[PDB]
Structure formats: structure tokens, C-alpha cells
Amino acid sequence: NVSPEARHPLVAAYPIVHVDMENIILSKNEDQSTQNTDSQTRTISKNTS
Amino acid sequence: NVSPEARHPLVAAYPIVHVDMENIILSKNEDQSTQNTDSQTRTISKNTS
Amino acid sequence: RTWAETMGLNTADTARLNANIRYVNTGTAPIYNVLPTTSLVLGKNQTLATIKAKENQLSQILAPNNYYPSKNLAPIALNAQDDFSSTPITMNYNQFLELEKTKQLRLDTDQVYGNIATYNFENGRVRVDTGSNWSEVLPQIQETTARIIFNGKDLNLVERRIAAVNPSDPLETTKPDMTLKEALKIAFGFNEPNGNLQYQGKDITEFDFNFDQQTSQNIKNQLAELNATNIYTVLDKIKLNAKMNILIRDKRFHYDRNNIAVGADESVVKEAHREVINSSTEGLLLNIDKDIRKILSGYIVEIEDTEGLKEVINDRYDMLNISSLRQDGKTFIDFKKYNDKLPLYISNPNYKVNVYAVTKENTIINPSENGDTSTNGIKKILIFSKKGYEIG
Amino acid sequence: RTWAETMGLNTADTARLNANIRYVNTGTAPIYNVLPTTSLVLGKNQTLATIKAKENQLSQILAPNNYYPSKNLAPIALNAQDDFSSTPITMNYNQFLELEKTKQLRLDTDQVYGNIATYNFENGRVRVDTGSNWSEVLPQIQETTAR
Structure with missing residues (x-):
């Protein structure tokens, strides 16, 4: 895999690596919830006056 | 990489490393929560007197 | 309820x-088992996190001029900070409002780990030695060699290193003598077909030479002793030394801080824009040269009446990307893909057509203040002026 | 509602x-696989933590008169205490209140780990030996040499 111009003795054969970013995907860590409720009251009110 | 001052037998070649801090980032570990409720009541009061 | x-x-x-x-990998030799260290920087220099690449993001082989993964494949994700890839990379609340506001986040490359594969004389194979990394070698190449950057192939910078002699190290004074002519003839592929140093077609005097502070000091000492003024005649007598940087660019264009070709001159824009292949309301399949076509922004048409005025159809900052590319070498400068999929407005065949273009030292990258959403503060060059009976 | x-x-x-x-590295010879032990001091001499640098904060080469990372690049982050970098450096309520007022925080450097690279006489190469560090060499220099 050494490129053909580096097979002279006086030319150095060495890699040059660098990383480049293409997308940044940030995800908001946030928790959420809903709730329902159905109350049913039956009263028996007695009065004695 | 041994610098040319120390390519002499009578000069020692040794590293002097120290670390310096250029920023401090402190993050208050605190959790916040909000809540909204809606509620409707249908009371049908009856009395026999 | x-x-x-x-x-x-x-x-x-x-x-x-x-x-x-x-x-x-834009180098000269492959690097095996690649693990780069990399850092996510918010804003100017506020670093969120430094991540050495984990096991999921290991590249087993990276040949020169290759990518991991391939160019047809989608990139790899880095979402871990733990050594076992169990912990995500997080942000506090102040670093999150600043990122949704300004949208500024870059990714540096501090270093690269990777191994070296060496020939086995026993069975003729090639075996990766996992005890030897490339970080023991690159600080020895960088101190005993001269460096030459040259951009005469598709206007991209190619960096090569050549073993030259250091006169203050007794092991280094054994290497053979390196002259500036011979260093070009073996690294990039120059020649001399008529006794003059040449690339593929270009004479060596079509380029210019820029050094660093330390190198340019040493070149002037070599030119005083040779009784020479022009460097382009004593190219076979300039001795190279260790730790020399030399930059060789094409003379015809303009260069920014990163030495990228980003602007041209007023004469070169009419040399490869002379002949026209076809002429109609829709077709500009032209022989735009590969030098200027990467440094321009787009094209601009101009309506010209009988008495003479300035009317522009694409008089807007974003209506200038009318550059489509076919598979025949002629870059298809279409006219109607920004015109509502309707043919262009031509009211009289006596009216001629004029087409222009802008480089990137006159192309702006943001909308202006009040009403300059158009080509007001954009200077161009006259390119196209023929009568409207040969185009139609 | x-x-x-x-x-x-x-x-x-x-x-x-x-x-x-x-x-x-303001010294004379290069150091490989640098891993400094460093402590974050709050106030005068109240120490919150001491962190030997983990594998994210490892400098492969540090030549003389060099930096890691170089001056055109942003600094590296040190936000872990666990050996596998999965536990954040923290502070309690009294340390956090005093840090907002006086803003006195500094960074000591207690010691530095790092290997040595020797010439191999067979094939001329230079190979870092991961068995010996500079903490064996550096006390031998300070007892025989004049500074």
C-alpha cells in the first residue's frame, strides 16, 4: 500500500490522518408524563333540626 | 528530539513537564420540574325537606 | 374529570x-488499527469532552487517499466516553442554550494512534506489530527531512518529505547530497524534456516559491555565493537541509490563509471561457477549466436592450447556484431551475445575451444589512458578449 | 387550573x-505516554480531588518546547475520577458556595508518568520500552549534576 513515489530511499513514507465531523446529533434528556383522574362522590346528608 | 544542547556527554537530557489550567467549568447538579392540571366538577345537589 | x-x-x-x-489518510503509507483522540469544542475554546476512540470506532486499515468508512457509506457515530461504551457525552444547561443559539461546535484532532506493518523475510508475509505505533517514527521523520508542499495536481495540496543533510549531527552527514531540482524530480514527478524543468506541460517558472523565516534566511546565503539573482536558473545547485519548509504554488491564482485557491485574476477568466459549444435558452455546456471552476461561485446572466441597460434575471444572493454537472466534462450551467420551471423571459430576438461569473474573493457568505440581497456590491468580469441571433 | x-x-x-x-515540556528530552497526577485545590490548601490522567487525557509524544494539544487547538477536558472514566468529579454544597464567592481554584502537579525511547542497534529504529519510566532516571540526575 506504500505509494509508488515513496519507494525511493530518500523519500519518506508516512501517514497523515485527520478526522472531520459531518453531523452533530444532540438529544435533549427530558422526561415528561400525563395523567387522568375520574372521581365519583355519592353523599347521603341527613339533617335533624 | 534530544535537543542539540544535550548531544554532549556532560549535559543531561531530561524532560520538565507541568500542567496549567486554562478554564474551569462547573455545572450545578439541580433538577427542575413543572406541572399543569385541569379539572372540572359537575355537582348535582338534591335535597328533600 | x-x-x-x-x-x-x-x-x-x-x-x-x-x-x-x-x-x-492523505499521506504516503497505511496506518493500521487507527484510534484518534478528538475533542468537542463549544464556542471559541470551551471544550465539552475529549474522547479517545473506543472499540466500535476502530479502523483496521487506512490506505493512503482512502476513507473510513467508504465515500458511498454513511459515517460512524461517536457517542461514548466510558472505556466500555456505556456512558454518553452530556451537556449542562448553559452549554445547551449556547448551542441552540449560535450553532457553533467543532471537532479537533489532537493525535492519532495506529500500528506499523513490516515485511517478514521468512514467509514473505506482512504482519502488524502491535507494540510499535507510528508515534515513534513521525518525530524522527520530521527532524531529519525537508518538506515541500505543491498544488499542481487538481489544485490540492500534496505534502512530501525528502531526506536532507543536517550539518550538526554526525549520523546525518552520511546521506547523499540533495539539490532542489532533484528533490522535485523524485517526489512529484517533474522532468526536463528540452533542458528545462517541467511538470506535465508547465515550465517551472509558472510557479512561485515561498519559504518560512528560517528557510528563507538560508536560501539567501546560497544565492549570494552563487552570484545569482533569479532562483529559477540555479535550481540544480541549491542544497537542501534538514528542517526546511518550501511552498510551491501556481502563480496564476489567489490564496487565502490556508493556501487554498480561492480567487483568480482578470486575465485568466477569459482564456478558458472563449469558445462556446452550444447556444440556446437553456444550454451552457462549456469548456470551463478545472482550475477556476472550483474557485468560482456561479454564473450571472444579463439582459441587454437595444439602447443599452443593465437587467439581471438572477439578481439575488441565492439565485447564483445554477451549476449542474453532466458526465462529459462540460459543466451544465442551466437557466430554468430557479425560474419556476418556466422558460426565460425573452421579448425580442434583437436583444442579445451576456453571461458573467464571480470568484470567491468577491463572494459574500451572509446577507447584508438593509436591501443588498442582490448583486449590488458584487463586482464581476465581462465574459460573454455576442449578438442574439447566434444563440436564440 | x-x-x-x-x-x-x-x-x-x-x-x-x-x-x-x-x-x-520546557525540558531537554521527549517523554512518551504522558499521564500527570494532578489535584484540584480549593481555597488555600483544601483539596477536592486527585486525578491521575485517564486514557482520554494521554499525550503520546511531548517533544521539548512543545504543547499538548498545540496552541492552535483547544485544551483537553478532565472530567472523570473512575479508572474507566464513568464517574464525574464533584463537590458538596459548602465547596460550591465558597467557589462562587472567592473563585479561588488552582491545579497542582504532583508527579508525571511517562516512558523512554531508546535506539535499537539492529535496525536503527527507536522503540519506546513500556517497562521503564522517567521516575527511575530523574532522581539519578538530581544527585550527580549541578543545576
């Missing part, structure tokens, strides 16, 4: 991250 | 820390 709704948060872990990255 | 709001805390884990650091 009661309804509710809740939301929660935390002001130290309010977001996560995921970085799609790709590796490039 | 009801609006509610809730703000919690924990008074031994109130804040975290993320120190941006950078290494400097």
Missing part, C-alpha cells in the same frame, strides 16, 4: 451528543 | 467539575 401534565429536567445532564465522523 | 414548580438538590453532589488543561 381531572387532566394533568408534567415535565422534568436536570441542569447538569440536559442533553446528549452524537458525532458522525469520517477518517481521511 | 394549577401551576406547579419544583427544584430539587442533593447537598453532597451539588456541582460537577470539568477542568480544561494543557501540558508543557
Whole structure:
């Protein structure tokens, strides 16, 4: 895999690596919830006056 | 990489490393929560007197 | 009947991250088992996190001029900080409002780990030695060699290193003598077909030479002793030394801080824009040269009446990308893909057509203040002027 | 219709820390696989933590008169205490209140790990030996040499 111009003795054969970013995907860590409720009251009110 | 001052037998070649801090980032570990409720009541009061 | 709704948060872990990255090797020899160290920087120099690449993001082989993964494949994700890839990369609340406001986040490359594969004389194979990395070798190449950067192939910078002699190290004074002519003839592929140093077609005097502070000091000492003024005649007598930087660019264009070709001159824009292949309301399949076509922005048409005025159809900052590319070498400068899929407005065949273009030292990258959303403060060059009976 | 709001805390884990650091070699010989032990001091001599640098904060080469990372690059982050970098450096409520007022925080450098690279006489190459560090060599120099 050494490129053909580096097979002279006086030319150095060495890699040059660098990383480049293409997308940044940030995800908001946030928790959420809903709730329902159905109350049913039956009263028996007695009065004695 | 041994610098040319120390390519002499009578000069020692040794590293002097120290670390310096250029920023401090402190993050208050605190959790916040909000809540909204809606509620409707249908009371049908009856009395026999 | 009661309804509710809740939301929660935390002001130290309010977001996560995921970085799609790709590796490039623009060097001269392959690097095996690649693990780069890399850093996510918010704003100017506020670093969120430094991540050495984990096991999921290891590149087993990276040949020169290759990518990991391939160019047809989607990039790899970096979403871990733990050594076992169990912990995400988070943000507090102040680093999250600043990122949704300004949208500024870059990714540096501090270093690269990777191994070296050496020939086995026993069975003729090639075996990766996992005890030897490339970091023992690159600080020895960089101190005993001269460096030459040259951009005469597709206007991209190619860096090569050549073993030259250091006169203050007794092991280094054994290497053979390196002259500046011979260093070009073996690294990039120059020649001399008529006794003059040449690239593929270009004479060596079509380029210019820029050194660093230390190198240019040493070149002037070599030119005083040779009784020479022009460097282009004593190219076979300039001795190279260790730690020399030399930059060789094409003379015809303009260069920015990163030495990229980003602007041209007023004469070169009419040399490869002379002949026209076809002429109609829709077709500009032209022989635009590969030098200027990467440094221009787009094209601009101009309506010209009988008495003479300035009318522009594409008089807007974003209506200038009318550059389509076919598979025949002629870059298809279409006219109608920004015109509502309707043919262009031509009211009289006596009216001629004029087409122009802008480089990138006159192309702006943001909308202006009040009403300059158009070609007001954009200077161009006259390119096209023929009568409207040969185009139609 | 009801609006509610809730703000919690924990008074031994109130804040975290993320120190941006950078290494400097003002010496004479290069050091490989640099891993400094370093302590974050609050106030005069009250130490919150001591962190030997983990694998994210490892400098492969540090030549003389060099930096890691170089001056055109942003510094590296040090935000872990666990050996596998999965536990953040923290502080309690009294340390967090005093840090907002006086803003006195500094960074000592207690010691530095790092290997040596020797010439191999067979094939001329230079190979880092991962068995010996500079802490064997450096006390031998300070007892025989004049500074």
C-alpha cells in the first residue's frame, strides 16, 4: 500500500490522518408524563333540626 | 528530539513537564420540574325537606 | 374529570451528543488499527469532552487517499466516553442554550494512534506489530527531512518529505547530497524534456516559491555565493537541509490563509471561457477549466436592450447556484431551475445575451444589512458578449 | 387550573467539575505516554480531588518546547475520577458556595508518568520500552549534576 513515489530511499513514507465531523446529533434528556383522574362522590346528608 | 544542547556527554537530557489550567467549568447538579392540571366538577345537589 | 401534565429536567445532564465522523489518510503509507483522540469544542475554546476512540470506532486499515468508512457509506457515530461504551457525552444547561443559539461546535484532532506493518523475510508475509505505533517514527521523520508542499495536481495540496543533510549531527552527514531540482524530480514527478524543468506541460517558472523565516534566511546565503539573482536558473545547485519548509504554488491564482485557491485574476477568466459549444435558452455546456471552476461561485446572466441597460434575471444572493454537472466534462450551467420551471423571459430576438461569473474573493457568505440581497456590491468580469441571433 | 414548580438538590453532589488543561515540556528530552497526577485545590490548601490522567487525557509524544494539544487547538477536558472514566468529579454544597464567592481554584502537579525511547542497534529504529519510566532516571540526575 506504500505509494509508488515513496519507494525511493530518500523519500519518506508516512501517514497523515485527520478526522472531520459531518453531523452533530444532540438529544435533549427530558422526561415528561400525563395523567387522568375520574372521581365519583355519592353523599347521603341527613339533617335533624 | 534530544535537543542539540544535550548531544554532549556532560549535559543531561531530561524532560520538565507541568500542567496549567486554562478554564474551569462547573455545572450545578439541580433538577427542575413543572406541572399543569385541569379539572372540572359537575355537582348535582338534591335535597328533600 | 381531572387532566394533568408534567415535565422534568436536570441542569447538569440536559442533553446528549452524537458525532458522525469520517477518517481521511492523505499521506504516503497505511496506518493500521487507527484510534484518534478528538475533542468537542463549544464556542471559541470551551471544550465539552475529549474522547479517545473506543472499540466500535476502530479502523483496521487506512490506505493512503482512502476513507473510513467508504465515500458511498454513511459515517460512524461517536457517542461514548466510558472505556466500555456505556456512558454518553452530556451537556449542562448553559452549554445547551449556547448551542441552540449560535450553532457553533467543532471537532479537533489532537493525535492519532495506529500500528506499523513490516515485511517478514521468512514467509514473505506482512504482519502488524502491535507494540510499535507510528508515534515513534513521525518525530524522527520530521527532524531529519525537508518538506515541500505543491498544488499542481487538481489544485490540492500534496505534502512530501525528502531526506536532507543536517550539518550538526554526525549520523546525518552520511546521506547523499540533495539539490532542489532533484528533490522535485523524485517526489512529484517533474522532468526536463528540452533542458528545462517541467511538470506535465508547465515550465517551472509558472510557479512561485515561498519559504518560512528560517528557510528563507538560508536560501539567501546560497544565492549570494552563487552570484545569482533569479532562483529559477540555479535550481540544480541549491542544497537542501534538514528542517526546511518550501511552498510551491501556481502563480496564476489567489490564496487565502490556508493556501487554498480561492480567487483568480482578470486575465485568466477569459482564456478558458472563449469558445462556446452550444447556444440556446437553456444550454451552457462549456469548456470551463478545472482550475477556476472550483474557485468560482456561479454564473450571472444579463439582459441587454437595444439602447443599452443593465437587467439581471438572477439578481439575488441565492439565485447564483445554477451549476449542474453532466458526465462529459462540460459543466451544465442551466437557466430554468430557479425560474419556476418556466422558460426565460425573452421579448425580442434583437436583444442579445451576456453571461458573467464571480470568484470567491468577491463572494459574500451572509446577507447584508438593509436591501443588498442582490448583486449590488458584487463586482464581476465581462465574459460573454455576442449578438442574439447566434444563440436564440 | 394549577401551576406547579419544583427544584430539587442533593447537598453532597451539588456541582460537577470539568477542568480544561494543557501540558508543557520546557525540558531537554521527549517523554512518551504522558499521564500527570494532578489535584484540584480549593481555597488555600483544601483539596477536592486527585486525578491521575485517564486514557482520554494521554499525550503520546511531548517533544521539548512543545504543547499538548498545540496552541492552535483547544485544551483537553478532565472530567472523570473512575479508572474507566464513568464517574464525574464533584463537590458538596459548602465547596460550591465558597467557589462562587472567592473563585479561588488552582491545579497542582504532583508527579508525571511517562516512558523512554531508546535506539535499537539492529535496525536503527527507536522503540519506546513500556517497562521503564522517567521516575527511575530523574532522581539519578538530581544527585550527580549541578543545576
